[PDB]
Design a protein around this ligand. Sequence first.
Ligand SMILES: CC/C=C\C=C/CCCCCCCCCCO
Length: 140
Amino acid sequence: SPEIMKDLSINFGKALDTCKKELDLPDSINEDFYKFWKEDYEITNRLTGCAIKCLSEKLEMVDADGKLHHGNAREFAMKHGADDAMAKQLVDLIHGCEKSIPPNDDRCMEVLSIAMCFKKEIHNLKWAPNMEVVVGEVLA
Ligand SMILES: CC/C=C\C=C/CCCCCCCCCCO
């Protein structure tokens, strides 16, 4: 649902300021986060990719091989309202995106591709929340 996806989004984005500090990222990536869920908006900036990658790592959603950690991704989804079924459906979308994307050895670009593919799948299911929810109040 969009309600669960909003809650996941807010919690995924809560470390954005911490990640910008760690990676010394410029404020030019902010607009990409404010528009993250805007239908048909494509994020292209690799640095935004590095931020998304950092956010995923903060939630321990990257395994030892650079792929989705399914158990921890499920833990995160369920904490914020997903049942077993939704957790598995979300994890299957991400895994499918990993398998579908143009391969890229730049992990910031790889994460950006997976995030854009996932966003499209969530729009396809009509589960997208309002465009700016990943940011919530983190940048205020
Ligand atoms: C799990 C996503 C839930 C809410 C908001 C945004 C997620 C989009 C990025 C999905 C992460 C894909 C690759 C990094 C995650 C772990 O490898």
